[PDB]
Amino acid sequence: FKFELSNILKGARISVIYSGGDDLFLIGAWDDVISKALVLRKAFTRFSAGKLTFSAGIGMYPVKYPISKMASETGVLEDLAKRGEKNQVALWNDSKVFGWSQLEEQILKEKMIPLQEALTNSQEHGKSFLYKMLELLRNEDQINIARLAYLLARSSLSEELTQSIFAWSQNKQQKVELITAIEYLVYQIRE
RNA sequence: UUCAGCGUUCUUCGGAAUGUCGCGCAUUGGCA
């Protein structure tokens, strides 16, 4: 907490308000805070050789927004993660609580990276297509599953991604990861 | 040689929205 933490966070736009196994508080750029939070969980397990788990709450706030409010709201997110599924992290919203491995791979690697590479390659697609997909996923109507499939056929995205998105939407866990992965990509792509 | 029309098609195939923004600013916070 006091020494290795400086090397783990090295190179990231993060300021550590306080440290320690009792309570850890860091304020940083959101993409950096998430990536370093994942690095920390992997390091903690390695350092402890397992048998030790860390629960965290991650929140996204405008810079002008008050620190006390940031601290209070993020405390609640940490509490969500702590009460059940203590290893799992809570990110941005109460609705999104994810295991650290889930957040790192089943969301930021299996879903966000394909979508990211697909969008960049496609000259025919854009944030607006990703917003359309998100609106269907958010509504959660059975018809939207069908409407997403019509959008996917029109979209012409690579078939394996098309099928993977379709499968993800039908599975409840995959869709929350798909929603989060799309939202993370939109936050990253947005200027 | 006269007397008559009769039957069959009644719309078809594509394209079914797309791209762009997806809140910003002030107070507050932060730095001094």
Side-chain angles (χ1 to χ4, degrees):
Chain A
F1 271 92
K2 297 316 173 315
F3 176 86
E4 186 44 58
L5 184 56
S6 297
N7 292 21
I8 295 172
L9 310 163
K10 169 166 316 163
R13 289 176 298 180
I14 295 182
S15 304
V16 199
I17 304 308
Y18 49 82
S19 288
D22 45 299
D23 287 300
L24 177 61
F25 190 158
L26 320 101
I27 181 176
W30 65 275
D31 45 356
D32 282 300
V33 142
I34 297 169
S35 314
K36 255 41 186 185
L38 290 169
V39 171
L40 183 70
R41 178 62 192 116
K42 299 187 292 287
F44 187 46
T45 317
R46 287 173 285 177
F47 138 87
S48 60
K51 301 168 183 180
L52 266 182
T53 55
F54 114 81
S55 57
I58 326 193
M60 231 175 56
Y61 307 95
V63 53
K64 276 164 165 296
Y65 187 82
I67 301 304
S68 60
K69 287 175 171 296
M70 295 184 179
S72 299
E73 286 167 301
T74 318
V76 175
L77 292 164
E78 196 285 302
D79 294 357
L80 291 154
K82 204 174 179 182
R83 297 176 226 121
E85 298 178 300
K86 313 163 301 186
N87 197 6
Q88 293 213 130
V89 50
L91 169 79
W92 298 335
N93 287 357
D94 48 63
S95 64
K96 310 175 177 302
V97 180
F98 297 135
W100 289 96
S101 169
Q102 173 185 2
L103 177 60
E104 182 161 58
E105 302 125 4
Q106 281 57 61
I107 310 186
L108 292 185
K109 171 182 183 177
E110 290 184 5
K111 300 186 176 54
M112 206 269 302
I113 306 298
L115 287 169
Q116 182 175 0
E117 80 212 4
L119 225 64
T120 307
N121 288 130
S122 56
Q123 308 308 299
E124 312 84 359
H125 283 281
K127 315 185 175 57
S128 310
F129 160 77
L130 264 201
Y131 271 91
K132 292 164 188 182
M133 287 195 45
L134 197 51
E135 291 165 58
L136 299 154
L137 299 177
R138 285 180 172 180
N139 195 56
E140 284 140 1
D141 195 356
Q142 195 171 122
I143 197 48
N144 304 128
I145 306 298
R147 295 174 177 178
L148 178 73
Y150 189 82
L151 171 70
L152 284 173
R154 290 187 304 122
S155 80
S156 186
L157 259 57
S158 70
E159 278 311 297
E160 65 282 1
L161 185 60
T162 302
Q163 270 80 71
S164 301
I165 292 177
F166 197 36
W168 294 331
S169 65
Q170 295 166 299
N171 175 241
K172 165 187 175 58
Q173 272 50 59
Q174 280 165 359
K175 191 167 62 180
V176 65
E177 305 164 3
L178 184 54
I179 293 172
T180 306
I182 290 179
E183 275 153 353
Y184 189 98
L185 184 53
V186 185
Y187 286 139
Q188 170 209 121
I189 66 192
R190 181 169 174 180
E191 199 269 356

